């Protein structure tokens, strides 16, 4: 019914790293780093791998911050996105053919050029709150319905 994905936010005291995807799902938007979890791989190991593949950064500890289920009307598979954050990274962000990373000051997060759901849950991430969310999309731009609640255990 649902497919596992990861999403990683590199969140430091005064800035956050986002990546501009050049192609595929979500191209043209700033977003966290992530993708599909593989066979035999833990969700956290998948999150660490995708962060390296897409940003060039090596993460140690990842902290669970949320879970968001996305439904796209007309598509059978739900996306079960496990969201993580970290403030301890090594390496410097790498631009590739697939992704352009850039740091943003927290007061300059580019919500108009991000997925629309981020405007709801990013403020929770910034205040170190954990959450469970569900967003029903029509296409890539329109949220038909959603739920979002803070939780103690992701």
Q: Check: CB of residue 117 under 8 Å from CB of residue 68.
A: yes
Q: Which is nearer to ligand F3E, 92 or 141 (CB)?
A: 141
99 touches ligand F3E (CB under 6 A): no
54 touches ligand F3E (CB under 6 A): no
70 touches ligand F3E (CB under 6 A): yes
Among residues 60, 49, 63, which one has the least CA distance to residue 5? Answer: 49
* Alpha helices, H only, 7-138: 43-55, 118-126
Q: Check: CB of residue 4 under 8 Å from CB of residue 41.
A: no
Q: Which is nearer to ligand F3E, 70 or 92 (CB)?
A: 70
Q: Which is nearer to ligand F3E, 3 or 92 (CB)?
A: 3
115 touches ligand F3E (CB under 6 A): yes
Taking CB under 6 A as the binding criterion, the range among 51-59, 103-111, 115-123, 142-150 that sits at the site for ligand F3E is: 115-123
Q: Could you tell me the smallest distance in angstroms from the CB atom of residue 145 to ligand F3E?
A: 14
Q: What number of chain residues touch ligand F3E (CB under 6 A)? A: 10
Which residues in 5-44 contact ligand F3E (CB under 6 A)? Answer: 5, 7, 31, 34
Binding site for ligand F3E (CB under 6 A): 5, 7, 31, 34, 70, 79, 81, 115, 117-118
């Amino acid at each position: 019914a649902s497919r596992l994905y990861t999403l990683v936010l590199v969140l430091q005291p005064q800035r956050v790293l986002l990546g501009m995807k050049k192609r595929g799902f979500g191209a043209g938007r700033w977003a966290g780093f992530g993708g599909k979890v593989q066979e035999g791989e833990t969700i956290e190991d998948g999150a660490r791998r995708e962060l390296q593949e897409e940003s060039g950064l090596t993460v140690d500890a990842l902290h669970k911050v949320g879970q968001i289920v996305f439904e796209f009307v007309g598509e059978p598979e739900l996306m079960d996105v496990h969201v993580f954050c970290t403030d301890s990274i090594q390496g410097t962000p790498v631009e590739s053919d697939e992704m352009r990373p850039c740091w943003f000051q927290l007061d300059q997060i580019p919500f108009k050029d991000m997925w629309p759901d981020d405007s709801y849950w990013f403020p929770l991430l910034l205040q170190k709150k954990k959450f469970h969310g569900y967003f029903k999309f029509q296409g890539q731009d329109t949220i038909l319905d959603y739920t979002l609640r803070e939780v103690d255990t992701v």
